[PDB]
Amino acid sequence: SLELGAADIQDLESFEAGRGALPARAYLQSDAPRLSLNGEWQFRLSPGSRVAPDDGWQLGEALNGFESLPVPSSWPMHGHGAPAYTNVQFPFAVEPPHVPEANPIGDHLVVFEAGPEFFPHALLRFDGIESAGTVWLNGVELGTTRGSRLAHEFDVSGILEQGENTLAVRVAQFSAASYVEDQDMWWLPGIFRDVTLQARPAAGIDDVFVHAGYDHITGEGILKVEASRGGQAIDAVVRVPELALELAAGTEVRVPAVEPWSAEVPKLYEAAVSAAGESVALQIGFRSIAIEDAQFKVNGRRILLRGVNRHEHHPRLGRVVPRDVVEAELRLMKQHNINAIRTSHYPPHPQFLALADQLGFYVVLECDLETHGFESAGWAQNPSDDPQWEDALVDRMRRTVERDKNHASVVMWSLGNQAGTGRNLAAMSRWTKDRDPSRPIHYEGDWSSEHVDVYSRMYASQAETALIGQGIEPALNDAALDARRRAMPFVLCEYVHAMGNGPGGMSEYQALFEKYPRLMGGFVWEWLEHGITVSTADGVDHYGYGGDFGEEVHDGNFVTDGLVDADRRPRPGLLDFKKVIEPLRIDVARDWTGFTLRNGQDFADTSAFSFRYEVEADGGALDGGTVDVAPVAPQSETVVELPGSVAALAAGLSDGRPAVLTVRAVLGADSAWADAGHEVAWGQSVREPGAPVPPAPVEPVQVQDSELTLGPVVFSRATGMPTSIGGVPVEKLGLTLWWAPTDNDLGREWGGADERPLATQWKDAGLNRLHTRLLGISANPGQDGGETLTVRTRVSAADKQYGVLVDYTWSTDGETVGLRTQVRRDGTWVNRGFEVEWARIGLEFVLGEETELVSWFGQGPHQSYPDTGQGARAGWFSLPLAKMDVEYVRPQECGARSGSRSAALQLGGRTLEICGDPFALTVRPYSQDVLDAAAHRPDLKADGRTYLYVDHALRGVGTAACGPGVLEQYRLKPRDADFILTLKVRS
Amino acid sequence: SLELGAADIQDLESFEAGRGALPARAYLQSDAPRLSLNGEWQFRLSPGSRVAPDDGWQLGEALNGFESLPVPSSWPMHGHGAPAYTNVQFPFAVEPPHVPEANPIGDHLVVFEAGPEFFPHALLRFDGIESAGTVWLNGVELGTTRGSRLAHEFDVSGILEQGENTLAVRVAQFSAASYVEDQDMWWLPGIFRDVTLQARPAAGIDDVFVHAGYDHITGEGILKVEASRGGQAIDAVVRVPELALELAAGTEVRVPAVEPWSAEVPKLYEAAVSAAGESVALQIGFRSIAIEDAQFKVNGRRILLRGVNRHEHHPRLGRVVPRDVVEAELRLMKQHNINAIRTSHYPPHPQFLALADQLGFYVVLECDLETHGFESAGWAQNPSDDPQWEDALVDRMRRTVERDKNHASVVMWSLGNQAGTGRNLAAMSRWTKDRDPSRPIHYEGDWSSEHVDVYSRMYASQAETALIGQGIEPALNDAALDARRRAMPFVLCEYVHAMGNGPGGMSEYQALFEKYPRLMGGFVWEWLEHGITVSTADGVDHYGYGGDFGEEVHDGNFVTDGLVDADRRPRPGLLDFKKVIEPLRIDVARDWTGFTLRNGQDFADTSAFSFRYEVEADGGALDGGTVDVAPVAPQSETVVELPGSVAALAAGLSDGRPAVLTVRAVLGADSAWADAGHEVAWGQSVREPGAPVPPAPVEPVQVQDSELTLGPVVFSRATGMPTSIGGVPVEKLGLTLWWAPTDNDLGREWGGADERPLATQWKDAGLNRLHTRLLGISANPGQDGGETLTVRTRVSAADKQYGVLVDYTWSTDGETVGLRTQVRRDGTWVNRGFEVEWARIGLEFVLGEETELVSWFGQGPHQSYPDTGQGARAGWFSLPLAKMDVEYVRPQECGARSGSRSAALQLGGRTLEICGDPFALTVRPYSQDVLDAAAHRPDLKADGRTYLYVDHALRGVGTAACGPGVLEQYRLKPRDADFILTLKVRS
Ligand SMILES: OC[C@H]1O[C@@H](O)[C@H](O)[C@@H](O)[C@H]1O
Ligand SMILES: OC[C@H]1O[C@@H](O)[C@H](O)[C@@H](O)[C@H]1O
């Protein structure tokens, strides 16, 4: 046997959960001496095990080949190799437990000093190594690590020396464990969480298990704090000063009056558990979880989960998320009405849990297990059902549960994600139910729900969710399993996939969640885009995605699918989500005399809020103030009268003049997660402006050799299009039916005979390449010598027989211009046997000047499409042109402002004003073809023109990249249509 | 009505066949004064009719805007606009008769002088204008032209002036006629054929209709020459000196003994038809065409059509083909055994016909009509069935027939191509049968064959062709039409689509053509690639195809689909086609005592040929000479004994020594189309070399720290691959299963549930991204202390569970190296529910040095794949590395030499020699990934290495880009396999 590296590879191919580590336990704050070994280490990278040197480097001998590297790190974020993104597909041949030859091996070394406080006993702790570590101290092998996002501790007693010590860690990127770590995220090897030396004094405390329940009938807490050392229960004293408690560890007591913990009111009691040689500090939240009457209840009440799936990602550091970024992102979540987090799909940094306890989130704490890449082979060889993997998978669940079991915020344990079904998942569930019956078990992969306590799905349609909400879904074949599942509450562990422009359809889910007790709510996929900061050859920073790092196989921009970008800047979807899930409902009366207020919270009343009103008109705010609202109980409602000055204004306003009344609930005082005045909920009542009044057509058409003039409009006799309006140059005017496909439009809409993505349907139909033929131009008699001008055109595409006849009728009184557009289908819009849907029915004006500022009356400030824009409120808005865009990583259709009634574009020294019945407004400095072709933001370039889109109709954006497409009510099928606009130019 | 250009556009949208032209007539060589107006004209281009100036330019006033342009020309070939390629799809919206707004309008002007010989009567002739011309002379509008490849003449009597004249022609690229001119070719506007002034003397001859039949029973000619002036029969004298004839025009006579015309023996008789004021010169070929007993017969005998489809294209001049290029390409066709031409899909230059008469080709002369782009809408609005188009389509057929009716080479009239079915095609057929019953009518678009005389198909499979050949195809529903069609002879007007590497499957068609009298033969699609010469930014010339000229819609490289490149350089397909269709069959006896000879000609005996033999061995020619063969009658065979010295050599050769006997039929004397010694047919008998003798394994394996040595081979202990063989550096050795997709592999194979192109099947299966895992390396006991080395590997792809186990066993005696490769499937090669076919089972050696010369024993000199290579004969070959490649316009798999038994690569100062049972040999200076990624030849770059492919199995190439894919016998399904090679390095 002559090949090199055989012993290293046999270890990497092991089915065992590693070796040599101390038993799994909780992460505990203790007074035992602690030394962090994080800092600058030495690092050497080899391309695989067979060439990784065996040169005594573990002693500090072979310094050459090594260079400085920060630890913790994801090493490809620091110039060593490259990140690689795959969604489902494995990046290596699927033949478990074997590893590919190209397998980056990273050797890490650090020298540190240990004082006498670390003797006689100490351990070394590793909070995360992706994916396989072998650890040596002073040349002695301590053992190995498996379970990339799980903690391992090694006893160093008798190996650690007083004074200098040399720690060496060989990390393999790929191992047998990679087959059970196939999450949809970047593959990033490294020692990516804390490395800590901890003294283990005699008569200490190794593990603690807090049991802190709440009896909602009596208001009592139920407390038992177990404590152990070396696997044996120990005498220890538990002190909870705020509750006047001093009790023995291991005894259950009833605490007469506790304030219970919830995400809404995250009450924590400081406690200490003390033995002779060590004391542990705890924060105890009293809460009990129950499943009863097909409802998920906390402290005796059904709750509504307004959730996100949170991965750990940083655009420059990879899987290392600095604490300040964590704290800020959790506050950002609370600022957007989120109350729940799923740790997709592995345990988070150990210090995350205390922050969730403190700020208040219901947490689904998920084990590091995902075998999704076996699905393509019908789950053949799936680790979850293979006996050889049982110990490894039970170990993952054990380490997951033991680490985080003391945290009130953890309300459910999840077995993993997309791991199929099998005997080892059942073993993990059995182990967990025996160890910790206080928390229900979650796992979506087995729809029969045989081994879980809630029924979980991902991306079930709104329609199917309504059936489940009513308890009327189709039955499982096994009547006993059906009876069990039908009596379970239902959660969407992933829904409304938030990739690109979207997600559409959030309101339809939310109405169901709020109506049906069996529906627990849902967790958006996902909180963040995993963009990675890169730069062009000219130094322009932007986010990269799959394939931008030379990957042979990858899934492109499916890793940029979040509510916020990788720097935690909100996408429009987050602003809409905040509104959709707002925990108070404010319904303002049409007559402005008051509002109905529903408190949708589960535990808190409305006393935390200040209720403010404001009336705005074109000239600015006409009135505003606060109203005193007697606190409304959870799940109750009331009617609140507004001050008489508000209704007096409504009465006084001349009909047709626009005005907006907004009632908002803001924090009355600072909280831990936002300042006083932070807006939580709002409602409005709008007095809409009258429809536009087209001008009397009293100006005649003047005929020149090559142009026509009609008041302030000049037209080409060769094209029929305006070439200037009030001196604003017009390069082109034409009909639009298409937009640059969103990420959702690039997804297949399964079901029905046509499974092409909408983008492909449009391409095949030629909708991305429309052309216009001029049929004729004629003047018609107007008023008092004036005339109208009708330009007749037909729009179609090369090689197609279908078209739309489009007639433009122009009129003017010399100041205002009227434009009537009439669209009539000429032939059936069917291509390849299927109907061709449209993106819009609108006009594109290409103006020969740049726009500095865009103002409008409608909704805003951010974009809105028919099935989004919940967060866009009625009002007057004004933005610099650059701020109208949306910085999606892959540029795509975005930035439309639906529901507009008037718009004004400042183009140098002139203002172009447009009025209509509701229209969508978009303004860009580059064309739709530039937007479509661009794969990253630096591909966009301004060309000196203004591209102005006025849409009479728009389709929705849906979630077709993963889950439901556009719901029927928001689809735009071909139709005939007519609409009027008025235009004016002010100088 | 205020738009510009309305009158011009109404004319362009006219359904009429133009206006003002003289009646259609023959192209006739006459003694009337003729002046060619070809030369340097003045030219101005506008983007459409609405902006095309009406500035009096027709008089020579508006010189500015005009620049010099050669006429004839295709104007986009001279920097004015750009060529655009579409196959089927129209490049404009389909709404006949309307034209798009973007419609290049080219104004052409020339001043010329006319002497007194052009008075009182003269005409102007235009032999082609694409697509719509309006003609003025001295400011007077003569009329308009429709039918782009048809001739028009205009009377200029009373308009032409003695002295200076100004001719003006406005040409529109697009018109209503574009809807009936949708051939698969470049769209190229221009005045692209001759412009001629012709005097029309009094008492002259306007038209002549030659009728020249042949009675094969008596050997007599049947002659009648009709002559007319102004539509009336005239007295004229017909003189045929070689036949001693002086007769009146309009009288039918029997000529006692004529030598008949055929493509094989194109006998022409010079004749003159003379009236008082004009004489016409003719070449008369006597031949009669008959359909009888379901056979197409000429001069009483069934013929076999060995044909090509000939478009008119030049890579720098467009639709203008210089006469010297025409003459050379026709000789090239004859040099490759072609005897028939289809003028796809329009009449050729008028002077082509005399060349076909003279050189000898059976011509299918096809009308300028193709409406293929209406098929996508179910033929809705198809001009062929629309009454408004009747006059226009009958006019096209009339002009087609009248121009060329006097030519013996025209044996069938074709109505057009891919024009669907309809009443106007029936009208065209009726008109033609009435006007010229001497020629059968062809049209493939109506499979019922109701209005034609032969049954024509395009790309019918070999299987379906065999059924038709036997008269057993499924019946038409109408019993009367079925009886008619079943009694028709059958032609493939297009078959064996010759795009890229291919066409495969030619032999299977040819065997049927030769076996079944009803099968007339076939015309390859197509003679030439329509490449257009372009240059890179660095000045590297190459051919461009669709999309290389900025087209919005195009069909890519489907215009480069020929047997020769646009400069008439043969592709390998032409060399194979020549052999497939060779008109003599030479079957050499295994014992080298003689050969059987079949004369497959229809009229000629074998007296034109010299029969030569040659015996070659490794050292060179051992013997050769000529053998006297008594002339063999058409369709007969004989046995010919070879000189005894040949068999004496065979007897004397030691068994296992290779030797090749080749018998060839060459021209004994110069012909009009090739020189004496030109090879027409050949056959061989091969004494094959013995199988390779692997060495005695008497050298042991020497183990070093990181390498192993086994005689002259060094191996890496990290990869198991050789790193040098005899000092030749080896960068990589591995198994191959894939090749860079050919044009055929990018085509869909219709039928069955899987219609992905093979290239897509491979991509989805990961066959283009295989990786290898090392399982182990071990030494085994050899002989007398020696050892063998077995390297065990597994080949698979990321995210797939299927693989192949590949074991390499190495042995050496210190000079020769033995390599045994064993391949075993591990799991089923099924992906997306369908079996994954392989391109090959072979080895790729990547050598770290450049190869200067490649030599081999096998077949050659050109490439061969399992279903091609008919033209590659057995022998010894040697080529510089560059000449091993094939210069396809889109680079793709090519250059394999199948059937090799030994190869030698000269790499600097060393020669690497390889021996095996039959293997395919390929050698390249760039990798397969470079070949696949390259879209044009300058994308290929040498990297300083040698890529050597040794294939134990290869799949065929088929014709799946259009028509049959690889036939079952040539497909390569996954299998287990083993094979032996020997290697030696000589310094
Ligand atoms: O777990 C390791 C990480 O822990 C975070 O809390 C810290 O802010 C980061 O800098 C890094 O050290
Ligand atoms: O003010 C900036 C941000 O800071 C928070 O503290 C505040 O409460 C939020 O509403 C947000 O506006």
Ligand SMILES: OC[C@H]1O[C@@H](O)[C@H](O)[C@@H](O)[C@H]1O
């Ligand atoms: O009359 C203006 C027209 O210009 C053409 O160049 C274009 O193809 C048409 O779609 C239309 O825009």
Ligand SMILES: OC[C@H]1O[C@@H](O)[C@H](O)[C@@H](O)[C@H]1O
């Ligand atoms: O028909 C026009 C063409 O005719 C060819 O015979 C000639 O060689 C070309 O130069 C061009 O004049």
Ligand SMILES: OC[C@H]1O[C@@H](O)[C@H](O)[C@@H](O)[C@H]1O
């Ligand atoms: O010799 C060059 C070429 O020229 C032809 O005249 C000859 O007959 C052909 O066989 C070809 O070889």
Ligand SMILES: OC[C@H]1O[C@@H](O)[C@H](O)[C@@H](O)[C@H]1O
């Ligand atoms: O042992 C050599 C190997 O090297 C790796 O880098 C490659 O992925 C494998 O396919 C194989 O070539």
Ligand code: NA
């Ligand atoms: Na884009």
Ligand code: NA
């Ligand atoms: Na290629």
